[PDB]
Amino acid sequence: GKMFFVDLSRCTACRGCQIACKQWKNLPAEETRNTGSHQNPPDLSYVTLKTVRFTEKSRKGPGIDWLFFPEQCRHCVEPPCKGQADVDLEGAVVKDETTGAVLFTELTAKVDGESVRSACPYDIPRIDPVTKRLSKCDMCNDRVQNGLLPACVKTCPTGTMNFGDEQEMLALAEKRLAEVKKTYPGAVLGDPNDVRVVYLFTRDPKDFYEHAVA
């Protein structure tokens, strides 16, 4: 199986990942306005599988602690969205055994949308108000199977985004966590046993976003 290591100690919130996701899948842009934040779109939606969340936290001494959270489906080893869907219909939510990708099919139109979202501990799944299909990040599974990095991983300039076999990605996450802790002592990996998208947070994950960890 595959896995992302996401080193948020290196993120410049350049939002190349946010545009790269939409370009590779030709997704439309949402209607947005500024409501006193750089953050936009303000949330995940049917046509937004990834948005970078911005949170400012006070620190003593000059400047702030600016926390950046490029949010996506965690591609859980044991995904509860699959369990809630399999109630109403099997094949609506499937699991790629080669890559580990959790994949929403067109049969998500059949199942109960709200309940499938409520069961996600990361509040990731999003429903089209018209066609009632569910959408989210799909690990760029097509690109992965043809030997390519997912769009958001290839586009990331800082070394925040990393992708490969769960073995060497876990190994790297541990090796990097140890190194980042020197600068950010409260640095932790997000549910590193349960997910295929392993975030290194520089502090309390909840500070980044309420659903950053389950």
Binding site: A13, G16, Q18, I19, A20, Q23, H38, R143, K154, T158
Partner: protein, 966 residues
């Protein structure tokens, strides 16, 4: 196979936004015959390794975009509607608008009987956004029509950067390159928001840290850059010279400078003449009446040969180094902390970290781009950076340099092609009216009697001659010399520049404007005045990608199309992925890109627009006579075209240069038709042409070196990432400038673990050596007259040492360093109704005026609207809540923006008082999108004599809450 990319042709390209020069891969439907289907990073490019920021990552959406121009639009005097029109019309009509205006305004002789052969009725802005070949052609086209008022983007960074770095090192260019940042031990980001404005740079900034580098950001605001640096030090706007002067004092007082580097490679040892002094904030030779210096009071004492005298002991009290120590003694920690706002402890923290790079085994780099370097003393700010780097031996070494980051994809190249009023291509000056012959012109080049001083500019005549033999290859250079226009020796040079072009336009002193790849209606400071001024034009030619605030100013806010008589041609060009050519990045890497899709609809490359526009003028002159037919009819444009179209390949071969006849040079034979292999084999006698001596070596007999995609590296090359076989850089593939300063007098590197060059077995090994000669036989700054890195720089208008003169007018009354408050060589009203320091800056997602990015729905998605960033304290004082609509106003105008209240902005303590800074992006304009807002340049003032540059980083404003219904 991935379906999306199956049956699509793959080509390479280079990003059309910032000067990092990131690689693209483009997929074009129908094996090349269709539209682009995908654009993303080139995994093999050594700079971005497949990475793109949101601007680069969204190029697909810029290109395949149905808001783009389709064909020419004509707007008639007093009309209120565009008129779709053909190309053959538009150009024919433009060719006539040129000739009429030229004929009526041409002056063969100025008001002193000096030959000038110029038109002053036509002006041209642009462009950093065109290909190098289109830039070179465009400058030559404008000058053959006899224009002198030729400016573009470059002006704003050129005026501060190039003189400061040329005075210091002998060239104006970024000294190192992007990959080389990873070799640095301490990175000072000061006057740069590089994580937002050069984002792939942080790939290499963060790799520096991985290998133990300390990252320092010195910035009035806390930005996306700040969040990823080890140290963030706030500085009060305009307190940079005090901050840098404290570092020079600290380095000198603690003997932290690298003595052997300073003794041999800087002018530390040169003896200044006794006429030099500095008292109460003034250098000797001050003319209090005219507010100007007699710079002859600053001259070195010379020996019996005219060579500057030297004490290699550094004991003579008139040694540059002892005068430097005396000058910076005043810049003690307590006064620097007081004026900057920086804590004494942070100042010690930063000074200690950066000054440690003085050790030969450590390298420090300084990154700045625009910041606030545009004011009167901006040149002195950059001079101070150069002086700190020369003291610490950081010039010429891997992970050192002054990395003066360029803005636009080809601003380096557009400058190299002389699209500024004062230069031809290759930084050969535009003649003044007193330069009556070619012989007098060459006379201006200073000479050196020092045998160790290469003084390479003594080769100028070979380059000026080969440039004239490229434009007029049947004519004698001395004859050819007469075709090209000249400026008034009497007049202040800045009268030909950006800022005066706007004042002149407003006084109706121009008939015709070329807005070629620029948006003046948004990019110009004081936009109300500038939109009004454009009315007073007879005609306007706008070449761009989209209809915009410039093309359509006649229907802007508050405008009456009926009342406005200006005649407007909008000519639509093709995007970067629809044409072939080169762009020159900030590191001087000249990179070739290819056509993916054919031009959209009936859009044209800039190359074809200008060539076809000119050939109409050429025609129309050949069958109606007038003005002065010589320049127009004789200009060699055959070498520019192939199969009936602009040829990027042939213009690039001309720019490189070829032998116009069999010739023997430097003890080698070359044949007629053959390509010049380097500028070392150019001649003054007419045996060679070359459109640009810097380009000589880029397109040889061995082929197009700009098009090389070869990662082959030796161990010493790969260790500091020179990548000498990826594309080509001027001059002659020297990747790090001044690299002779990286070694001692035997040619051993100071820091062998990161050698740039090394003397190994009668060869220099590594980078191409910057100056030929055995170790210890040449001074290392070969473009300098005397051959040294100048700590003392006597050519600068404000003095040979940087000195703090307050660039903030309104809130500051005290200078703690002298009795001279403002710049002694330099009118702001400071109306109390506007008590806040307004500033404008960029965000990652938008480009310039936003003409390109406000048309890309993914970038508008992320940053849809103009905003106003304010402190919590100033939100409290004005009862503004986060997300509230606010009115920002100045003497020059007003606009509405969404408030962003944040601790990222803090009050400046200036003279016991809290002074508030108010921040706006200048990325917005009325055309698009709906509810985006207008340009922040509504609020900015038009200006002063020094600079020829606007002020956009400090201007007095008010901000008021705009009220909703409960």
């Amino acid at each position: 196979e991935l379906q999306k990319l199956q049956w699509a042709k793959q080509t390479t390209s280079i990003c059309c936004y910032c000067a990092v020069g990131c690689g693209l891969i483009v997929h074009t439907a129908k094996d090349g015959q269709g539209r682009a289907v995908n654009v993303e990073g080139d995994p093999d490019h050594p700079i971005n390794e497949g990475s793109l920021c949101p601007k680069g990552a969204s190029i697909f959406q810029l290109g395949e975009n149905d808001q783009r121009g389709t064909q020419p639009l004509y707007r008639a005097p007093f009309s209120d509607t565009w008129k779709p029109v053909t190309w053959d019309f538009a150009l024919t009509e433009i060719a006539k608008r040129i000739k009429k205006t030229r004929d009526a305004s041409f002056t063969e002789k100025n008001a002193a009987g000096d030959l000038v052969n110029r038109t002053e009725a036509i002006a041209s802005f642009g462009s950093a956004a065109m290909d190098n070949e289109e830039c070179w052609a465009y400058g030559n086209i404008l000058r053959s029509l006899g224009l002198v008022y030729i400016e573009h983007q470059a002006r704003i960074x050129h005026s501060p950067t190039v003189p400061a770095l040329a005075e210091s090192f002998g060239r104006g260019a970024m000294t190192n390159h992007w990959n080389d940042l990873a070799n640095s031990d301490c990175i000072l980001i000061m006057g740069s928001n590089a994580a937002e404005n050069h984002p792939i740079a942080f790939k290499w900034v963060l790799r520096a840290k991985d290998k133990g580098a300390t990252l320092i950001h010195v910035d009035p605001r806390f930005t996306r850059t700040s969040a990823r640096c080890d140290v963030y030090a706030p500085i009060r706007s305009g307190a940079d010279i005090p901050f840098l002067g404290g570092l020079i004092k600290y380095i000198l007082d603690n003997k932290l400078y690298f003595t052997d580097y300073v003794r041999e490679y800087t002018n530390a040892s040169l003896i200044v003449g006794e006429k030099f002094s500095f008292k109460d904030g003034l250098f000797s030779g001050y003319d209090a009446a005219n507010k100007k210096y007699d710079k002859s009071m600053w001259a070195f004492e010379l020996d019996a040969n005219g060579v500057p005298k030297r004490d290699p002991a550094l004991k003579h009290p008139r040694c540059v180094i002892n005068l430097l120590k005396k000058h910076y003694e005043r810049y003690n920690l307590d006064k620097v902390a007081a004026i900057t706002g920086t804590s004494k402890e942070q100042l010690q923290q930063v000074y200690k970290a950066y000054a440690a790079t003085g050790k030969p085994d450590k390298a420090g780099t300084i990154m700045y781009a625009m910041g606030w370097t545009q004011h009167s003393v901006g040149v002195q700010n950059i001079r101070a950076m150069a002086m700190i780097q020369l003291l610490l031996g950081n010039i010429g070494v891997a992970g050192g340099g002054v990395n003066a980051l360029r803005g636009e994809s080809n601003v380096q190249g557009s400058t190299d092609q002389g699209l500024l009023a004062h230069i031809w291509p290759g930084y050969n000056p535009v003649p003044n009216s007193k330069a009556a012959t070619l012989e007098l012109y060459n006379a201006a080049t200073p000479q050196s009697k020092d045998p160790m001083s290469v003084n390479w500019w003594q080769n100028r005549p070979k380059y000026v001659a080969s440039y004239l033999k490229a434009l007029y290859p049947d004519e004698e250079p001395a004859a050819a010399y007469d075709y090209l226009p000249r400026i008034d020796a009497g007049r202040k040079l800045t009268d030909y520049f950006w800022l005066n072009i706007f004042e002149k336009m407003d006084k109706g002193e121009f008939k015709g404007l070329f807005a070629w790849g620029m948006n003046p209606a948004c990019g110009g400071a004081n936009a109300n005045k500038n939109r009004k001024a454009m009315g007073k034009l007879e005609w306007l030619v706008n070449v761009n990608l989209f209809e915009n605030e410039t093309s359509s100013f006649w229907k802007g806010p508050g405008m009456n199309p009926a009342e406005i008589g200006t005649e407007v041609f909008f000519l639509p060009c093709c995007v970067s992925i629809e044409k072939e050519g080169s762009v020159a990045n900030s590191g001087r890497w000249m990179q070739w890109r290819y056509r993916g899709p054919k031009p959209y609809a009936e859009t044209k490359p800039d190359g074809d627009i200008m060539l076809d526009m000119f050939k109409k003028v050429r025609e129309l002159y050949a069958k109606e006579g007038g003005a002065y037919p010589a320049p127009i009819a004789k200009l060699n444009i055959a070498d520019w075209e192939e199969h009936n179209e602009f040829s990027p390949t042939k213009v690039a071969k001309l720019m490189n240069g070829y032998f116009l006849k069999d010739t023997e040079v430097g003890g080698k034979q070359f044949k007629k038709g053959q390509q010049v292999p380097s500028f070392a084999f150019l001649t003054a006698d007419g045996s060679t042409c070359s459109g640009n001596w810097l380009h000589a070596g880029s397109f040889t007999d061995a082929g197009n070196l700009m098009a090389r995609r070869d990662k082959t590296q030796t161990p010493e090359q790969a260790r500091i990432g020179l990548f000498p076989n990826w594309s080509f850089c001027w001059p002659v593939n020297r990747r790090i400038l001044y690299n002779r300063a990286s070694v001692d007098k035997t040619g051993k590197p100071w820091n062998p673990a990161k050698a740039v060059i090394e003397w190994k077995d009668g060869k220099w090994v590594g980078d191409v050596v910057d100056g030929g000669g055995d170790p210890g036989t040449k001074h290392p700054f070969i473009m300098q007259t005397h051959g040294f890195g100048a700590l003392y720089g006597p050519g600068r208008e404000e003095g040979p040492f940087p000195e703090h003169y307050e660039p903030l007018e309104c809130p500051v009354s005290k200078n703690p360093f002298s009795k001279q408050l403002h710049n002694p060589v330099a009118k702001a009203v400071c109306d109390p109704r506007y008590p806040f320091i307004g500033t404008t800056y960029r965000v990652t997602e938008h480009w310039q005026t936003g003409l390109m990015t406000r048309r890309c729905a993914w970038l508008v998605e992320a940053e849809p609207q103009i905003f106003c960033e304010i402190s919590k304290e100033l939100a409290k004082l004005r009862g503004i809540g986060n997300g509230d609509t606010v009115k920002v106003s100045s003497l020059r105008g007003a606009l509405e923006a969404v408030a962003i209240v944040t601790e990222r902005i803090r009050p400046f303590k200036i003279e016991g008082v809290d002074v508030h800074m108010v921040g706006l992006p200048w990325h917005y304009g009325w055309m698009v999108p709906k509810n985006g807002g207008d340009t922040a340049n509504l609020l900015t003032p038009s200006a002063d004599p020094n600079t020829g540059i606007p002020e956009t980083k400090a201007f007095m404003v008010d901000v008021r809450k705009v009220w909703s219904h409960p």
